[PDB]
Amino acid sequence: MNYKKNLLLLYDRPREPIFMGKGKSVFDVPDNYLTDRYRPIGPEIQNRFGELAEERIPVRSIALPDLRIPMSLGRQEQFSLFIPRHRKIAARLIDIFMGMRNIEELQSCAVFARDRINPYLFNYALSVALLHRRDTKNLDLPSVVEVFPDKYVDSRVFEQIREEATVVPEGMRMPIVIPKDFTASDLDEEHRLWYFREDIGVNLHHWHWHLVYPGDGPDSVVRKDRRGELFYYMHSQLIARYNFERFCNRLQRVKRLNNLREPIAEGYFPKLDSLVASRTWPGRVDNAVIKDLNRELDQIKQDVSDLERWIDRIYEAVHQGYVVDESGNRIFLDEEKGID
Amino acid sequence: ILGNIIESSILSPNRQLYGDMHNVGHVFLSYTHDPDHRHLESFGVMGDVATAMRDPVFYRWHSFIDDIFQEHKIKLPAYTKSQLTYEGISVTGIIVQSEGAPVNTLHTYWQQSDVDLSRGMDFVPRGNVFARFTHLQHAPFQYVIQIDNTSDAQRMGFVRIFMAPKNDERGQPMLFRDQRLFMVEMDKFLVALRPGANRIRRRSNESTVTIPFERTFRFCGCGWPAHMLVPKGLPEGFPADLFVMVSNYEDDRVVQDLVDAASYCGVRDRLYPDRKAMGFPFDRLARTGVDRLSNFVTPNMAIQSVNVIHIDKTVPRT
Ligand SMILES: [Cu+2]
Ligand SMILES: [Cu+2]
């Protein structure tokens, strides 16, 4: 349908306001849908882009769900599916997008939200919705690489592209070669696994898994057959494949982190720049040590001991051969369901 | 080596080069009033071993010299988690008890003790001459230490106890980079730990850091005077960090045919009976990851908050 096709426009140019041209189309955004910055000049600003497109897409203003929690994350912050607060925030947004009565009310909601929500979050939530809703199966979503190259690409190329696109006419622009083996030199023996660690496909795979088996969200999207066993097996095959690569690079099988209190020998500096946060990613020095965490905005307060304690409780359950639920009953780790 | 150079004992490997810097600097600070002897004057108190600690400048000169010593120390690698760990041993807690005072409280006050000076009174008619001295004193206390041993055998250990200010001058909690240098050695003693729990009792008056009160104020002995063990504190209360560490006695001991076991007397004992650097584990920089004493600790260590209350009463010797 045209409606389905229109949702895909929400992926095009994440930080460009939704009233700007997306492909051959424009969204006719209602006055009350504009963000605070643009609303006061709204009618002047909507027209400039609105006389370029072939198509025109009407959006009905409707009453929308409460987006305060999804909006609590800053637009120029980073989004982490590991940080509990953010998972809650993502869970909420998936809830909202899942629960729109139909595809027209989804369009309307997403068009309101997009310019008010952190783009990475928006992109995650929407994608999870669209994969799991009944009325939006099919619908070939764009790869997150084409939508956010900044999570895949040496920062150095963005100004190279910007120059190429400004100076050179469309028919004459030559493709940009993406640097490889660029995050470290020969002094780091680890550089050699660039072809694995930094492969677009390997990294895309990791993202995709997290879209299909999200850990928090409506039951509909979370409960999948043997998802706990898959978590195990998927992470397991990575290690095995990774070791395989290590043997082809004159290296040893990857050592576990013995101890959370000993220095971590392998530094890593990603050389990525998040255009969304308008801030580079921090790296980690050779031989850094994990530190107790107290980040109020993130809502993480956690000593290394808390982590060590969980580890001991799990090992105890695995050795007992059972775990204890909150009611206090025992769930046996049998040979079908134990792994799960 | 460096100590022999700076003091400039005859054990210095090269006096002509590195000089006699400590002793001569003492002499310099003592003769400002008459450096060429034109006023035929003797030396101020800094020029005399018997009296130099009386002068404030003593602490400023020694502080100067300590920076040289520290410039060496900090070249050495930080003790690692492994070097500081005693596998099996976990000190779960430590407290101090003084009679007539809440737990984790030390008390100080003033005492008057008489000394006979008759032997020092040349050309004075004979008979006892009792001088009444005022000096700081502390109420006797003990340490109670809880120590779990998981290793199924008997384990030997040096117990190392220090105490330091909790806060800096502006009342902010002290970071380890500074606190390590503020750590005062309160005791060091050998112990035999049985499997499972151990409760350990140690009296203030057993400290190997001190000598009996009786050595200072009326046969062998020498170390720090017992009445000065505890810092004065404050009338309102003064917070301190009490610290303890059980280190592996097997790695600490010294093979000395004729040898408390942590006791040291420089006259009698041929070797210093502890293989760790004097001041262990505070004498070096902190490994990566530590910024404060909370982060520093291994399980065979433990910290406790202690209130050091000064009471401004004076009391006769008992
Ligand atoms: Cu994963
Ligand atoms: Cu001196």
Question: Collapsing DSSP states into helix, strand and coil, what is residue B316?
Answer: strand
Of the partner residues A259, A289, A292, the one whose CB lies closest to the CB of residue B288: A289
Contact A262 B81 (CB under 8 A): yes
Contacts of A283 (CB under 8 A, 6+ apart): A267, A268, A269, A270
Question: Collapsing DSSP states into helix, strand and coil, what is residue A105?
Answer: helix
Contacts of B61 (CB under 8 A, 6+ apart): B25, B26, B29, B46
Closest-approach residue (CA) in chain B for A285: B288
**CB contacts < 8 Å between A and B, how many?**
15
Contacts of B125 (CB under 8 A, 6+ apart): none
Long-range CB pairs of A180-186, under 8 A, 24+ apart, other chains included: A182/A154, A182/A271, A183/A268, A183/A269, A183/A270, A183/A271, A184/A268, A184/A269
Q: How far is A289 from chain B (nearest CA, A)?
A: 5
Q: How far is A305 from chain B (nearest CA, A)?
A: 11
H/E run at residue B143: strand B141-149
**Residue for token pair 């006769």:** B316
CA pseudo-torsion sign B97, B102, B105, B111:
negative
Distance of alpha carbon A292 from alpha carbon B302, whole angstroms: 18
Contact A291 B289 (CB under 8 A): yes
Compute, in degrees rounded to 10, the torsion defined by CA atoms A297, A303, A309, A315: 70
DSSP B154: -
Among B310, B305, B177, B160, CA closest to B241: B305
> What's the CA-to-centroid distance between B3 and ligand 2, angstroms?
12
Of the partner residues B81, B288, B295, the one whose CB lies closest to the CB of residue A287: B288
> What's the CA-to-centroid distance between A243 and ligand 1, angstroms?
17
H/E run at residue B28: helix B21-30
Q: How far is A262 from chain B (nearest CA, A)?
A: 7
- Which ligand sits closest to the CA of B65? 2
Distance of alpha carbon A163 from alpha carbon B69, whole angstroms: 58
Distance of alpha carbon B145 from alpha carbon A77, whole angstroms: 49
Question: Collapsing DSSP states into helix, strand and coil, what is residue A55?
Answer: coil
> What's the CA-to-centroid distance between A311 and ligand 1, angstroms?
18
Beta bridge partners of A284: A268
> What's the CA-to-centroid distance between B58 and ligand 2, angstroms?
7
Q: Verify whether residue B7 is a known catalytic residue.
A: yes
Beta bridge partners of B315: B111
Dump strand ranges (E) for B103-223. 105-116, 130-138, 141-149, 155-165, 184-193, 199-203, 210-211
**Residue for token pair 């051969």:** A321
Distance of alpha carbon B22 from alpha carbon B161, whole angstroms: 30
H/E run at residue A308: helix A304-320
Q: How far is A175 from chain B (nearest CA, A)?
A: 45
B202 contacts B142 by C-beta, under 8 angstroms: yes
For residue A259, the chain B residues in CB contact (below 8 A) are 81
Tell whether A260 is within 8 A of chain B (Cβ).
Answer: no
Resolution of the experimental model in angstroms, please? 2.7
Among B225, B198, B211, B180, CA closest to B143: B198
**Residue for token pair 């003797």:** B42
Residue B205 token pair = 């008056």
3-state helix, strand, coil in chain A (%, to 5): 45, 10, 45
H/E run at residue A96: helix A84-98
CA geometry: angle B169, B175, B181, nearest 5 deg:
80
**Residue for token pair 């002094």:** A187
Distance of alpha carbon B47 from alpha carbon B30, whole angstroms: 5
B169 CB burial (10 A radius; 0-12, 13-18, 19+): exposed
> What's the CA-to-centroid distance between B62 and ligand 2, angstroms?
6
Q: How many residues does chain B have?
A: 318
Residue B79 token pair = 């003790």
Q: How many residues does chain A have?
A: 340
Distance of alpha carbon B119 from alpha carbon B126, whole angstroms: 9
> What's the CA-to-centroid distance between B34 and ligand 2, angstroms?
20
Beta bridge partners of B162: B185, B243
H/E run at residue A240: helix A227-247
Of the partner residues A261, A288, A290, the one whose CB lies closest to the CB of residue B81: A261
Closest-approach residue (CA) in chain A for B81: A262
Contact A261 B295 (CB under 8 A): no
Contact A290 B81 (CB under 8 A): no
Question: Collapsing DSSP states into helix, strand and coil, what is residue B96?
Answer: strand
Dump strand ranges (E) for A178-299. 273-274, 279-280, 293-295
| Phi, psi angles (nearest 5°) of residue B136 | -70, 150
Closest-approach residue (CA) in chain B for A263: B288
| Phi, psi angles (nearest 5°) of residue A204 | -55, -45
Give how far the C-alpha of residue B114 lies from the chain's centroid of Cα atoms, to the nearest Å. 26
Tell me the longest C-alpha to C-alpha distance in chain B.
75
DSSP B296: H
Residue environment code for A79-116, b if the CB has 16+ CB neighbours within 10 A, otherwise e: bebebebbbebbbbbbbbbbebeebeebbbbbbbbbbe
Distance of alpha carbon B23 from alpha carbon B69, whole angstroms: 16
Tell whether B81 is within 8 A of chain A (Cβ).
Answer: yes
Among A188, A189, A185, A160, CA closest to A175: A160
A122 contacts A244 by C-beta, under 8 angstroms: no
Contact B289 A263 (CB under 8 A): yes
Which residues of B does the annotation place in the binding site for Cu(2+)? 22, 26, 62
For residue B296, the chain A residues in CB contact (below 8 A) are none
Contact A287 B289 (CB under 8 A): no
Q: How far is A287 from chain B (nearest CA, A)?
A: 8
Q: How far is A260 from chain B (nearest CA, A)?
A: 11
Contacts of A334 (CB under 8 A, 6+ apart): none
Distance of alpha carbon B75 from alpha carbon B88, whole angstroms: 31
Tell whether B295 is within 8 A of chain A (Cβ).
Answer: yes
| Phi, psi angles (nearest 5°) of residue A246 | -60, -35
Interface test with A, best of B81, B176, B294 (most A CBs within 10 A): B81
Tell whether A286 is within 8 A of chain B (Cβ).
Answer: no
B188 contacts B201 by C-beta, under 8 angstroms: no
| Phi, psi angles (nearest 5°) of residue B110 | -105, 135
- The answer to whether the peptide bond before residue B281 is cis (omega within 30 degrees of 0) is yes
Beta bridge partners of B308: B106
β A27-28/A57-58 pair status? parallel
For residue A305, the chain B residues in CB contact (below 8 A) are none
β B224-225/B210-211 pair status? parallel
Among A91, A109, A99, CA closest to A29: A109
Contact A263 B288 (CB under 8 A): yes
Tell whether A289 is within 8 A of chain B (Cβ).
Answer: yes
